[PDB]
Amino acid sequence: DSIFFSPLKYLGAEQQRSIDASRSLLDNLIPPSLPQYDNLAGKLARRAVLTSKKLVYVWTENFANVKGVPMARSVPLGELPNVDWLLKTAGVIVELIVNFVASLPASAAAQFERIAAGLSGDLEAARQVHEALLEEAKNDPAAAGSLLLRFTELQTRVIALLTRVGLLVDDILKSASNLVGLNRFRAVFGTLRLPEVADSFRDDEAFAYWRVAGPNPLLIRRVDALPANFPLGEEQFRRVMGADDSLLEAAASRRLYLLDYAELGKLAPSGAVDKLLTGTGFAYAPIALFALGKDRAGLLPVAIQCGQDPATHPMFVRPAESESDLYWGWQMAKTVVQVAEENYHEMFVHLAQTHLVSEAFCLATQRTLAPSHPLHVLLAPHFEGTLFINEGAARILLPSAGFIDVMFAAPIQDTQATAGGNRLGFDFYRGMLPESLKARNVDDPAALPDYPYRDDGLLVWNAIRQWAADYVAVYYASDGDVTADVELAAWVGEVIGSGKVAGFRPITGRSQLVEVLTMVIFTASAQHAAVNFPQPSMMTYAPAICAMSAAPAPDSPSGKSEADWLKMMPPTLVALEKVNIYHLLGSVYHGRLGDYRQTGFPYAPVFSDRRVTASGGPLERFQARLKEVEATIRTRNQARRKPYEYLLPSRIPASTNI
Numbered sequence: 001d002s003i004f005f006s007p008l009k010y011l012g013a014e015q016q017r018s019i020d021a022s023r024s025l026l027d028n029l030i031p032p033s034l035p036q037y038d039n040l041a042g043k044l045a046r047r048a049v050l051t052s053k054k055l056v057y058v059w060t061e062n063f064a065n066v067k068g069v070p071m072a073r074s075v076p077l078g079e080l081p082n083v084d085w086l087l088k089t090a091g092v093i094v095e096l097i098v099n100f101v102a103s104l105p106a107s108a109a110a111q112f113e114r115i116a117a118g119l120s121g122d123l124e125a126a127r128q129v130h131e132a133l134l135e136e137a138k139n140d141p142a143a144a145g146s147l148l149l150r151f152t153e154l155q156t157r158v159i160a161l162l163t164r165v166g167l168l169v170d171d172i173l174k175s176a177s178n179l180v181g182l183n184r185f186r187a188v189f190g191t192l193r194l195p196e197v198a199d200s201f202r203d204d205e206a207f208a209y210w211r212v213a214g215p216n217p218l219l220i221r222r223v224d225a226l227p228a229n230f231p232l233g234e235e236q237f238r239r240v241m242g243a244d245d246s247l248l249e250a251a252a253s254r255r256l257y258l259l260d261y262a263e264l265g266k267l268a269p270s271g272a273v274d275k276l277l278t279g280t281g282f283a284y285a286p287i288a289l290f291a292l293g294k295d296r297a298g299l300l301p302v303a304i305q306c307g308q309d310p311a312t313h314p315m316f317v318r319p320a321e322s323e324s325d326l327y328w329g330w331q332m333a334k335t336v337v338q339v340a341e342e343n344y345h346e347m348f349v350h351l352a353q354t355h356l357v358s359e360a361f362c363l364a365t366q367r368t369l370a371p372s373h374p375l376h377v378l379l380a381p382h383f384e385g386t387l388f389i390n391e392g393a394a395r396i397l398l399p400s401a402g403f404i405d406v407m408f409a410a411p412i413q414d415t416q417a418t419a420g421g422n423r424l425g426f427d428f429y430r431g432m433l434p435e436s437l438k439a440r441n442v443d444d445p446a447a448l449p450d451y452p453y454r455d456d457g458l459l460v461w462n463a464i465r466q467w468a469a470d471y472v473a474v475y476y477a478s479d480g481d482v483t484a485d486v487e488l489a490a491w492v493g494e495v496i497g498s499g500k501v502a503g504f505r506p507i508t509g510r511s512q513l514v515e516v517l518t519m520v521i522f523t524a525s526a527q528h529a530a531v532n533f534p535q536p537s538m539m540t541y542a543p544a545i546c547a548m549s550a551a552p553a554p555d556s557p558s559g560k561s562e563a564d565w566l567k568m569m570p571p572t573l574v575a576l577e578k579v580n581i582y583h584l585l586g587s588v589y590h591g592r593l594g595d596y597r598q599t600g601f602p603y604a605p606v607f608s609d610r611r612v613t614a615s616g617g618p619l620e621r622f623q624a625r626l627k628e629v630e631a632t633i634r635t636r637n638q639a640r641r642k643p644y645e646y647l648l649p650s651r652i653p654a655s656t657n658i
């Protein structure tokens with residue numbers, strides 16, 4: 001063959017992954033610098049590297065199933081998950097496959113059992129190799145550099161295993177689809193225990209507590225006057241809250257809180273949506289009022305309107321225990337709210353506002369901040385696995401007949417467009433935790449005492465903020481250093497432009513830079529954790545929450561039966577997909593906020609700059625503060641009606657990778 005083919009003959013992806021892994025340890029010995037403080041050789045090299053980065057990290061707004069959302073055109077080799085994440089994730093998926101196959105009719109399970117057994121054995125073998133390599137490294141630290149190649153080869157093996165897992169899952173889903181009171185909603189769990197919510201789901205106080213301690217703590221807002229389209233009367237309010245209370249005094253005393261799902265748009269179809277796989281489905285854009293008692297101990301649900309127009313949707317009011325003719329209509333109205341909730345939570349709060357925001361910051365960072373830029377060094381750990389998991393969301397979860405088409409009532413094209421639109425409209429500054437709390441008038445613990453997301457979230461927000469401030473102060477001596485940084489300027493430009501981050505604006509000083517970095521890091525780590533990790537314990541049991549109902553909203557508060565409510569429950573296929581996807585997505589904890597070490601071998605420090613890593617220095621102070629936050633949250637959870645554990649720093653990954 002031609003002599004110019006010589007370099008291509010033996011070139012392969014594994015070899016290149018090894019090179020990428022070793023080069024990253026080597027590059028990381030370069031002391032970080034702002035471009036204006038770098039020497040000319042450094043300026044030349046960093047500009048060359050950034051130009052090459054743009055070949056690898058490429059924007060598109062036409063990615064499959066997420067049209068209009070800025071995405072990576074493809075995931076670079078160096079952005080594939082490391083073997084630690086691959087093993088964890090493969091472990092969970094294989095466990096779930098084995099569990100599901102065990103519940104299938106024996107004849108239909110025979111071949112899947114054998115294949116699943118083989119995959120489980122291969123996974124165990126891979127785990128054993130991982131353990132043996134780690135042991136080798138501990139026993140001979142001097143050989144760590146050469147052992148890295150064996151970890152890269154193990155990565156190849158686990159990638160191959162997960163490819164085989166993918167083929168099996170596709171076959172199992174087809175078989176399941178052909179095959180498939182409340183017993184069926186327990187049966188889909190197989191060997192898995194029901195989540196805690198299965199015990200409490202019909203309780204009204206539990207239902208209200210979701211608004212401040214559930215997967216979507218962002219929608220609830222204080223109201224000073226009821227909306228014109230929510231015509232609840234004084235008599236209705238007194239029936240629930242007492243003869244000596246009133247709407248006027250509850251409003252004035254900051255005791256009224258509203259959930260209004262108007263923003264769902266096409267995620268709340270106007271009527272029935274018939275699909276071949278799942279039959280007739282419905283979802284809703286309801287309005288619900290909650291109130292604190294005069295002692296402010298906790299929220300109670302007061303009233304629910306199952307749609308936006310009161311002319312066509314009657315008012316459901318919380319019934320007394322004796323009012324058996326109102327009991328089931330009320331359960332149905334709460335189900336309407338929970339259906340809206342899964343749509344709002346998963347498509348907006350989780351997918352659009354964590355995952356799809358962090359996608360843009362990852363791409364901008366890699367394309368415009370040199371690897372030797374201190375902000376690249378800081379931010380990159382917070383995007384580990386983000387491009388990969390988001391390509392997975394688009395390719396695997398969002399196509400026709402996939403998990404989201406099954407589990408969410410709307411037509412899949414409407415779901416995609418509405419989630420994408422929500423991402424495009426999400427204002428970066430307004431979406432900051434403190435701004436969100438203030439805008440919704442839920443920031444004052446005197447007004448609303450029990451709001452665990454706020455109280456724990458602010459501890460984590462403020463810890464990150466002080467870290468960002470300390471870190472910025474190491475590199476930027478003044479606002480002039482901020483505006484003179486041409487890489488930061490390009491980064492801001494890419495975030496505004498190609499990244500389509502609403503509300504993003506030029507960064508002109510250190511205080512603003514700190515706020516921006518706080519939000520980027522918080523969004524990647526804590527916010528994602530708070531809205532992702534409740535999935536297994538709160539969202540796996542369909543009668544407590546599901547993004548589709550098999551029946552319309554109740555047409556009357558009076559006269560409904562248990563049968564009427566049961567008709568809202570989803571088909572078994574929806575319940576099966578739900579338990580499995582939500583167990584998976586909340587069962588992989590990879591990396592930890594504040595650790596700042598590689599999450600794969602050789603687990604090296606992220607930071608080489610002695611000013612950052614000094615004893616008692618910025619990083620140590622951040623880590624110490626997170627440990628104080630952990631203690632404070634653990635103490636709070638001893639006093640709370642139920643523990644809220646999603647913002648414990650020990651359970652917050654550094655990045656959005658699941």
Ligand SMILES: CCCCCC/C=C\CCCCCCCCCC(=O)OC[C@H](COP(=O)(O)OCCN)OC(=O)CCC/C=C/CCCCCCCC
Nearest residue numbers: 096097100162163165166346351392393396576580581658
């Ligand atoms: C739902 C709302 C989510 C909202 C937001 C989500 C955002 C981010 C999450 C994105 C997650 C992306 C998907 C998961 C990522 C898992 C890690 C991963 O990347 O795995 C890659 C493998 C192979 O890839 P490949 O392209 O070769 O072939 C895909 C199938 N043709 O994919 C899977 O095993 C699919 C598992 C699907 C889950 C099955 C559940 C367990 C099966 C048990 C039996 C099921 C019986 C029914």
Ligand SMILES: [Cl-]
Nearest residue numbers: 274275276277
């Ligand atoms: Cl269809």
Ligand SMILES: [Fe+2]
Nearest residue numbers: 528532585658
């Ligand atoms: Fe997630």
Ligand SMILES: [Mg+2]
Nearest residue numbers: 106109110113
């Ligand atoms: Mg058998």
